[PDB]
Design a protein around this nucleic acid. Sequence first.
RNA 1: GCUUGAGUCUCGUAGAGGGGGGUAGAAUUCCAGGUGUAGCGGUGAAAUGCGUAGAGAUCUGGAGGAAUACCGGUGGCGAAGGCGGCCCCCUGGACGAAGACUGACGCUCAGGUGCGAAAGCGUGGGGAGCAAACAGGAUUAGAUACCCUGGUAGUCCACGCCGUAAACGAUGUCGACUUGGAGGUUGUGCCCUUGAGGCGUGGCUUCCGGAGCUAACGCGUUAAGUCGACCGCCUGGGGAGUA
Lengths: 65, 88, 65, 100, 116
Amino acid sequence: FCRFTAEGVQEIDYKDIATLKNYITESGKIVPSRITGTRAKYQRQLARAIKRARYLSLLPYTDRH
Amino acid sequence: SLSTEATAKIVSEFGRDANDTGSTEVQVALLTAQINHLQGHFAEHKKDHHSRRGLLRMVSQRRKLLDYLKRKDVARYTQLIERLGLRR
Amino acid sequence: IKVRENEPFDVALRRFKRSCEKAGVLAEVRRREFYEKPTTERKRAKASAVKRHAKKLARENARRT
Amino acid sequence: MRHYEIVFMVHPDQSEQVPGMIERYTAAITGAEGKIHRLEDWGRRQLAYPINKLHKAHYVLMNVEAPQEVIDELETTFRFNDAVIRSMVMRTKHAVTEAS
Amino acid sequence: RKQVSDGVAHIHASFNNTIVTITDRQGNALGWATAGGSGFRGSRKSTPFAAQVAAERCADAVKEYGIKNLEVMVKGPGPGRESTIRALNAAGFRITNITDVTPIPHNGCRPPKKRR
RNA sequence: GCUUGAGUCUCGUAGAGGGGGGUAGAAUUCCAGGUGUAGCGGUGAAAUGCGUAGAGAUCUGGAGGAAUACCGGUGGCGAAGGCGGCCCCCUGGACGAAGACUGACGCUCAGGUGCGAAAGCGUGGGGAGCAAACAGGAUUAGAUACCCUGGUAGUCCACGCCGUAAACGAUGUCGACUUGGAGGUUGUGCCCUUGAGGCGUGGCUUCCGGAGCUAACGCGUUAAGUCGACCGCCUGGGGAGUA
C-alpha cells in the first residue's frame, strides 16, 4: 500500500470527515499505519484530525453513543 | 523571540550596512535584546528550566564575544558597552 | 461489538468482530501500572521480532532434507 | 497578523439568534481592524454523541484573522453563553476559503 | 406484569462468576439468575456450563412477562459470555442484537498490583 | 591578514522540548432515585468482608479526583533526569536549501554555579483509584511473607528542601581518519511531477557484519579501530564508602 496524502499536496483537515471514516475502525478507534500503509508523517497528523473531529462531535469516541 | 523586523532594526544601527549581520558588534547587541526580552518571560513562570538553558547559553555567548572584542580593539569595546549599558 | 445480522443465528459472525481487541485490552488493564516493565517487555518483543526476520531470511539456504 | 479557524456549535432552540450572533462577532473583529476570510455556516447537523443529553447542534465556522487580545475577549463570550456549546479557537499559517 | 414483548438480556461475565439479568427497552429489570445460585460453587462457578444453567434458570421466571425477542449485552472477559447466548436461542428467543459493552478506560484509574 | 573551525542572519521543516491557562470523552468510586431478589465478592480451595435495614446486577441524574485507550511505532524531542488526549498564550534548541556576514572569536576544565527519577521533608490545599504501615482471613511445623478482604501516610496541586538510583550504552567531552549491507525517521536538489518514478545529497537513529582491536564475550564510521586535546578516575579481597 501507499499514502494518498503523499500522492497529492493536500492537507488532512478535521472538516473533511468523509475521508476520515475510512481511517477509523467500526468502533471509533484509529487504524494503525501498519495496516493502512500511510506515511508516518501523515499518520501523525491524521490522528490529530481524528482527535479534533472527536471533540467537535463529527466522529464518535466509542460506539456506545 | 526577537521578531524579524526587530532583528533588521538592530543590524542597521550597529552594523556597517543591512547585510553586515555577523560582526562582533552587532552580535553583542542582538544577544542583549534577546537577553533583555526573555527577562520578561522569566519574570513570571520561573520554572522554565529547559528555556533558561537557552538564555544561559546566549548569556555566556555574549561574554565570549565581549572578551574577544576587548582583545581586538579596546576602543570599540568601551564604545559598545556604554551604548547598551553593561558591566553590571 | 454490534452484530444485528439477519437469517440463521450463530454468533459465529460475532466472534470475528469481538475477539479482535476486546480481551487483550481488558486483561492488561486487569492489574499493575507497571510504569517501566511495558518498556522491558516492549523492547524484548521487537528484539525477538527481528530474530524472526533475520533468521528466516537466512534459513532459506537449505533444509537438510 | 494572526490567523484563526474558529468553529463553535450553537444550541438548536436558539438557531434564529445565529445570524444575529454572527454579525455580533464580526462587528467586533472588523471594528478592531480585522480581516475576515470565511463565514461558512453548516446548519443543524447530527452529533456523534449527546452533548448535555442533546443531539443535532448548529455548527458555525468563521476562519477569521484577528489580533490575539481581540479574540481573547471572544472565547470568554463563548464561556458566558448557554446557547454556545463547544467552541474551538484554532490556527493555521494561512487561513483559507471554502473547505467543507 | 405489563406483558412486555422486546427486552434486553445483560450478561455480566466476571472471571469468578457470571450474572445474567433480563430487562426491557426502558432499562428497569425483570429477573436475574447467577452461576453461584444454580448449585455451582467454588471452582465450578468459572465454567461456561454454569453460565448455561444460569441462563435457563433466567429463561424461566420470565415466562410471566412473555418475552420472545431480546437483545444480548455481554460485559467481562468471562469463561461464559457465549455459551450463555446459546442457551437463549435454544430456549425460544429471537436474538436481534448482540452487543459488547465491557468497560474500557481510556487510561484512567490505577489498577492493583500484579499478584505473585 | 585569510576562511576551512566557531558564530550571526535570511527562508523553511519536523517534534510526548519546557512553562501557564482552558477543555473533552472513556472508566473507577461515592451519593440519590426507579426496577428487581438472594446472593455477591474472592480463591488452587476457603474464609474474613458485603447483603433481606434490599446487596450484586440494571437504568437515569449528580458530585469529585486522577490518568489520557486506539493512534503508538529497536518512532520523535531534550544536556541528562525526563516528556504522551485536545486548544490557546509565552518560550528553548536542533536541522535543511541557497546565499550573505564577522574573521580563530576555538576545545577542554580543578574549584565554582545551575539542573537533576522515585521515595522522603516543611507549610498550605486536594484526596477517585492505588497503596507502605497497620488490621483481619488463609496457607504453613512456624508465616511476623508471598495469597485474600480492608486500609493510613504517600501518590495529586502550589511554593521551598533533599541532591540520591543498575542516575546504565555499567562506554567523559571534542576533533580527524579508516571496507560494506538492510532499514527507520526527517529536510532537500536534479531529471520524463510526465506514474506512489529514477538519480542524488544532508541530519538524527536501529540492526548485522569486514579489517583491526579485545583475556574472551564482543565492539565495529554513532568503535571498545587508528590518532590528537583536556578532564574525571583506578592501584589485592574483607574492614568500608564505614569511623
